[PDB]
Amino acid sequence: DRFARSLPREAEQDHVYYHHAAGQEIILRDWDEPVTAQAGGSTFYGGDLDGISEKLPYLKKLGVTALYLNPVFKAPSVHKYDTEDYRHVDPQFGGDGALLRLRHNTQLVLDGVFNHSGDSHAWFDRHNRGTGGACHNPESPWRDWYSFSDDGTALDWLGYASLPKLDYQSESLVNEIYRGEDSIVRHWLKAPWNMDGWRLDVVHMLGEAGGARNNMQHVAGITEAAKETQPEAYIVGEHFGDARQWLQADVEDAAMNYRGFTFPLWGFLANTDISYDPQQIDAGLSHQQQLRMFNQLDSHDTARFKTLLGRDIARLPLAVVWLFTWPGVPCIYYGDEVGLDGKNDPFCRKPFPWQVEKQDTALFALYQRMIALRKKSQALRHGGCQVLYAEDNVVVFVRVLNQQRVLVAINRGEACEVVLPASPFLNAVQWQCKEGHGQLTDGILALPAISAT
Numbered sequence: 001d002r003f004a005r006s007l008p009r010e011a012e013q014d015h016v017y018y019h020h021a022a023g024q025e026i027i028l029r030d031w032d033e034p035v036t037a038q039a040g041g042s043t044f045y046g047g048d049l050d051g052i053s054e055k056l057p058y059l060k061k062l063g064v065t066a067l068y069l070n071p072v073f074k075a076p077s078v079h080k081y082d083t084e085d086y087r088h089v090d091p092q093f094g095g096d097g098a099l100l101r102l103r104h105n106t107q108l109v110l111d112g113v114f115n116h117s118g119d120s121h122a123w124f125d126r127h128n129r130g131t132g133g134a135c136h137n138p139e140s141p142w143r144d145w146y147s148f149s150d151d152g153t154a155l156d157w158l159g160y161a162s163l164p165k166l167d168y169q170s171e172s173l174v175n176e177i178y179r180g181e182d183s184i185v186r187h188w189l190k191a192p193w194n195m196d197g198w199r200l201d202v203v204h205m206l207g208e209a210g211g212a213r214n215n216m217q218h219v220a221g222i223t224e225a226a227k228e229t230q231p232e233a234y235i236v237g238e239h240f241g242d243a244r245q246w247l248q249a250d251v252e253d254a255a256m257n258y259r260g261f262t263f264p265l266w267g268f269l270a271n272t273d274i275s276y277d278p279q280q281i282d283a284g285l286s287h288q289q290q291l292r293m294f295n296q297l298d299s300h301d302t303a304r305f306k307t308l309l310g311r312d313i314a315r316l317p318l319a320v321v322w323l324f325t326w327p328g329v330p331c332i333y334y335g336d337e338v339g340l341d342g343k344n345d346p347f348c349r350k351p352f353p354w355q356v357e358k359q360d361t362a363l364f365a366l367y368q369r370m371i372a373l374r375k376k377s378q379a380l381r382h383g384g385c386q387v388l389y390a391e392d393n394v395v396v397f398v399r400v401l402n403q404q405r406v407l408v409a410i411n412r413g414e415a416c417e418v419v420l421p422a423s424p425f426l427n428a429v430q431w432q433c434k435e436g437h438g439q440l441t442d443g444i445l446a447l448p449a450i451s452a453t
Contacts, residue, residue, distance in 0.1 A: 001078045002351050003334070004055050006048030010092050014041060019076035020120070020127070020162060035347040043078040045351050049094040053105045063371055066106070066196050068294065068331025071113030074122070078346070079300065081201070082118040082163050084129065086176060087184045103193050109331065111199035112185070114177050115206060116163035117145070145173055168207050168218065178222045189229045197234040204239035216245050226253070236294060247289050254292045254329065261295050261326060269319035270308030274298070283390035290327050291382050297333025300349050304342035313339065314453035317366045318410065324370045325380045325399065325408045337367030379406035394419050415452045420445035
């Protein structure tokens with residue numbers, strides 16, 4: 001929603017309908033206006049469809065190639081965890097034909113909302129948009145996607161009534177989910193549109209109290225599913241937890257990473273938890289996925305970096321770099337490089353602006369070249385990984401394999417501490433130039449310069 005405003009027709013007016021009245025009457029807010037819309041409603045700002053085609057000159061020219069993106073179908077809400085209509089792209093976006101060009105224009109990424117379901121979904125449909133009414137009737141093609149008790153509240157999405165929990169098994173649902181021809185992912189895995197990938201949303205619960213086989217053959221089944229249509233098929237599966245049902249190669253080929261980067265190193269850079277619970281810190285998953293696992297900044301389950309930042313401009317262009325030498329397949333948190341804020345959900349969620357993105361704003365021509373370097377350089381892509389200097393107000397380490405090099409020196413401190421990052425155990429010629437401005441391997445330790453922090 002925070003991304004870009006393509007259409008004023010798919011932009012619904014305020015009071016245009018409601019959701020779960022109240023389901024109070026819609027409230028909008030101008031760009032550069034506050035994050036959660038005024039009493040008697042919210043919300044509803046950026047992210048429409050036609051503009052990214054002409055924002056890949058911002059995204060993709062020359063930076064990004066494919067876009068990690070949230071769930072993409074019907075829910076009235078700004079977020080849409082609760083799917084209503086499945087196959088067609090959600091109206092607010094638009095549809096899938098000014099879209100259909102767009103993944104081939106994009107020639108992209110996506111995310112699945114399928115875990116939770118709609119209450120006001122187009123089949124079971126309390127508030128009765130669908131024609132079906134399982135909320136009333138036990139005789140419909142869409143009823144036993146839940147089992148029994150079919151009343152006020154029970155076990156669903158950590159107990160949410162609006163997001164019901166489905167009766168997921170074989171051969172039953174996921175016929176319009178992943179597996180089948182009807183399935184939308186597989187209803188979108190082909191020409192002309194064919195799907196680079198897709199994403200799972202806290203399915204760690206899936207299936208009948210989650211973390212049983214149910215959770216994962218549901219998944220293992222999808223692996224061959226991956227491997228059915230496209231070898232490019234690339235997958236994730238949301239669990240906050242350490243990855244394992246996250247991958248086995250058998251289980252996955254990728255997954256999401258709080259634990260990866262986003263929860264570990266802020267203590268170091270944004271000083272603390274993603275939750276924003278302070279951290280003091282001075283100085284598992286198979287080869288392929290390592291340079292394959294997803295890697296980004298903040299989210300709509302947690303706080304944002306500036307809140308963490310020592311209110312310090314320095315802190316983030318620093319931190320951002322850490323995401324470059326980094327492995328996995330990063331899918332950065334927009335405003336990742338620009339310096340923006342995002343209070344606490346749904347404040348965290350915050351409009352994508354224009355103005356501070358200037359490159360006088362030293363962001364630009366940092367995060368710009370810094371990706372670009374990791375696209376000049378595969379040493380920050382498929383390399384081996386060493387870790388180097390243990391210093392308060394320093395950190396060093398490398399990526400090591402058999403064709404190139406990059407080590408990476410950093411200075412923590414408000415003021416420098418001269419470091420000397422040696423690359424003899426490196427075992428590559430000394431006195432030699434290492435592109436930058438600029439260094440000799442001489443002394444088998446790097447003597448160059450970069451500002452306090």
